[PDB]
Symmetry: D2
Subunit: 229 residues, 4 copies
């Protein structure tokens, strides 16, 4: 999968997801920094917070590049806080809108890019889907996003082959982890983008090192290591 | 099919389509004035014009009541001009989003509720779908909406079994025809609704007689016989 | 939901599901004996066992009446043992193919018609979907289909408001429960049909009484009471 | 697009399309005889003839690799005559099942791999979709398949940039044209495969040169030139 998030002055979903020359739309069939999966055609999702702070989501099980309704409507959806993703499904995992990121607990939107053995994760009655990413999202929400770095280190110890890239937002904050896959940050005058990979060739993009947490609030970007072992 | 249109102060798609107690959402499974079909579950569409006058559309081939994305997002989509529809498909007709109203030529959004023998219509390379309503839409667009009344009157004579209820909008006007099916109008302080059936029990609703043209602009509703 | 099952001489999926004058196809938009839901348009599924005993499934989240591929292909799919269902989704439940019956553990195909509070069911890592029917199916599979009667009687106590109509098959056996919704049986010379409602006006149809378990093997139809 | 056909002893859809190491399933995300970056994820279809000669079809607008129902059911569908395809949609064409090959006139199944300006094709009321391939199929059916070679040469002269690879079958015959793409043929002891590209590394595969008609009946392959400019 590939994901992108925005925190700042309002931008349209189209501006963030569809319009950039190497953005999520292009990454659905031609990603540039993806080591796992040739493309991200197994659905997509876009979540945003409206002016009242309500989390809203549009998700699909079809390839993003083929969605004529989203192409038409996305320019009309503007938000200060967005999380969107294109999916590459793990083999055996249902391809269905409820399995597409972003997941939500009503306060947070969350996307997972990676791979995790479901067998090491706690059972839950609160997942939105049975697929591995949704079970992981359930765990993360249960533990609280303030504990994101510790939760991810814990899971990473339980499954040494797990890839645990998280991107989450609550309308006034972004949180993200690097754990086996890519993430970059772009600081604009009007806000901050976090993304699996840069959506263009802007020299302002900065790559986040592996096994780190990124915490964005009121224009401050703070990058911290995670615990290994 | 059942359709609804709005022209006036900005209104959310949810407010027009999902929230009323007997609106389009309810009509997808429990319509109140539908003589053809018991339901409208073969897709839906919602078209609107944004603040810059661009026609935008969301269309689906699934039942409107089942769409969690539309239920989540529709409240955040507001427009001065909306055309939406729930579809009941005729046998043999493709059930796919391109076959769901509203159709568009970029300037006008258009919904057809009814039935027409495709054989009486010209061949076209400009239709959005193979389904009869899309072939009819193509014809209506090629003649121009200012000639809507004449086009429908003509097709009505070519196919005396056709039902040709049209609802159309361009951001600043609504046009509709009654030809074998229902249309009602609601004049609000902030705009006008046209609908296959009233979405509530507001005493302001009034029915348009069959075989008429309806023209809405600058808050005026002009109803004239097709002839 | 409405479901149907067949155990007997090979029969096409179309012959069981699409062709009868009041069968599952018609029940997707005009069910005759359904107290909960107006229709069953929120997807469908058909499962069958091939000549090697492999369970195979086709499921959708769209209305059965609109599926041109199934209408075209179903006549070419023949089996001695079939379980199929059309779905009416409970409010708030995902409408997605993994949430449509039949569910499977590889040996059994299973359909649930009803409603059950997920809060009374144990957590599982083995469910195919998050919807209540899938969580219930996981429990049923875990306990084993030979304990179906015990499982349903237990859940019916835990949730007094639950409706627990099960229809399941393993290639050589049908199992079903009535627990708050309808079921009928037709014994033909070449096999047995179990169905939420009769698919035609055959005088052979007989209604199964509520709070019973049906066991077809095969050769023999058992209709035995459940614990209430 | 990529397509494949079978004419011979009964063979399952799975055995033809899903099971080979480089067959249609693999070609949906990793074709071997188109440039890298290319894929065929914009739907798929499988048509076959049953014992009574009835043409039957399963079509989708989703990527073939993602379809759990087809993977489950296809091994149980066996036929003496199969035409299947995975679609890559060209600019502004609808992505919808009616637009996926194979098309049918009740007697023939037909797949088109290529590109043609709808502007040079006759208008029709008999097309299954609005897409260029459906309009072309309507023309081909109207002229009759015994005229396939002449029809393709005609269209090819009207549109010098057209790519017009056809693969068709009627239950007892295959017909194909090469026109801008190549076809390959495999003669097994029990039947004949025609394919956009070989589905394995069997040394029996041979390539059909461009601008030819292929006619298969009773495991007898006849290759003829098409008329040139």
């Amino acid at each position: 999968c590939r994901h992108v998030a925005w925190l700042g002055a309002p931008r349209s979903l189209a501006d963030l997801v569809l319009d950039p020359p190497q953005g999520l739309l292009v990454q659905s069939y031609a990603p540039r920094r993806q080591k796992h999966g040739l493309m991200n055609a197994d659905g997509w999702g876009a979540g945003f917070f409206d002016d009242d702070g309500v989390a809203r989501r549009w998700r699909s099980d079809k390839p993003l590049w083929g969605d004529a309704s989203f192409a038409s409507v996305a320019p009309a959806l503007r938000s200060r806080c967005v999380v969107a993703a294109v999916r590459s499904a793990t083999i055996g995992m249902s391809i269905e809108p409820s399995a597409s990121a972003p997941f939500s607990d009503g306060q947070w939107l969350l996307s997972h890019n990676g791979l995790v053995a479901r067998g090491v994760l706690p059972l839950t009655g609160a997942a939105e889907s049975t697929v591995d990413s949704a079970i992981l999202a359930a765990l993360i929400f249960s533990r609280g996003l303030d504990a994101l770095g510790a939760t991810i280190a814990e899971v990473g110890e339980l499954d040494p082959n797990a890839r645990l890239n998280i991107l989450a937002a609550n309308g006034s904050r972004l949180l993200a982890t690097t754990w086996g896959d890519t993430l970059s940050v772009l600081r604009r005058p009007d806000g901050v983008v976090l993304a699996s990979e840069p959506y263009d060739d802007d020299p302002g993009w900065s790559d986040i090192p592996d096994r780190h947490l990124v915490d964005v609030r009121d224009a401050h970007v703070v990058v911290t290591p995670l615990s290994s072992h």
